[PDB]
């Protein structure tokens, strides 16, 4: 098992990238105030191999200016989990 590297980027579109993980099974989602967003209000990457024996994926959602502090990206992989804010 290889734990994902999780990185959140703000462009407002916020994107949560999980990279370099194994096995391919992973849960990633945006939350607003801890409440998991529906699948249909997020944009989803495929889970793709990276040529080093691991996988990567991503999930994005569109938010309004000033709402960043309400949004977090939740990850579960291989019995572990984490929560990441939008960087400021």
């Amino acid at each position, epitope marked *: 098992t290889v734990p994902p590297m999780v990185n959140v980027t703000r462009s407002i579109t916020v994107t949560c990238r999980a990279s370099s993980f194994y096995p391919r099974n992973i849960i990633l989602t945006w*939350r*607003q*105030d*801890g*409440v*998991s*967003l*529906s699948h249909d*209000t997020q944009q989803w990457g495929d889970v793709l191999p990276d040529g080093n024996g691991t996988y990567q994926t991503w999930v994005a959602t569109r938010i309004c200016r000033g709402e960043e*502090q*309400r949004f*977090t990206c*939740y990850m*579960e992989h291989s019995g572990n*989990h*984490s*929560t990441h*804010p939008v960087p400021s």
Partner: antibody
Amino acid sequence: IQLQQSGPELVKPGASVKVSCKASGYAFTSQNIYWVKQSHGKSLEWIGYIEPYNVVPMYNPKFKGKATLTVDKSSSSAYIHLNSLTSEDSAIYYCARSGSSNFDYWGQGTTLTVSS
Amino acid sequence: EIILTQSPTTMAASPGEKITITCSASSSISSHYLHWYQQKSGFSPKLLIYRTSNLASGVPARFSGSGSGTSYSLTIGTMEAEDVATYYCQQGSSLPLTFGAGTKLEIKR
């Protein structure tokens, strides 16, 4: 999933109180804990929530400087500290946990009476 | 804050009656951030409907919800004795999070 709160409390006006909420049935740091006030015969009022993984609270401005939210991993518990207590603070206080909604699961409530 | 106005304040339904209660928001919200709770007397509230129309775990199929914008509703397709409770709508679109004042449903017999 179970949220078990501490028992009823009588506290003197002007003093403080800390109410606990022990969360079981899921990984403690994987979901936000919320707090709600219900005065007798009245509606539900959101106090605040805390994201336990990074320990980041958010407060209703109605309760800024009244309520302080904390967590503790060894007890699998969230806490609400209420200061400068008055009769208006007498109410049932509920812990809750978000998920698909802001309040997927609720504790049993804690009755706080502020009186001398 | 977003004010949620629930109507009726109270209502008695006959057994087997289809009953609809309404939640009106002071401004437009996404249906994904509107939820309903049921509080039976002597108990804590429980999640009933999430994101406007999705039944929570343990909730029987006679419940449903609809709405968008500023206008939301909850329907019980056939009123049963165990459905006597206060029903609250709640929005999570904007901070502070707010609840309606509740609709108290009782049953005729």
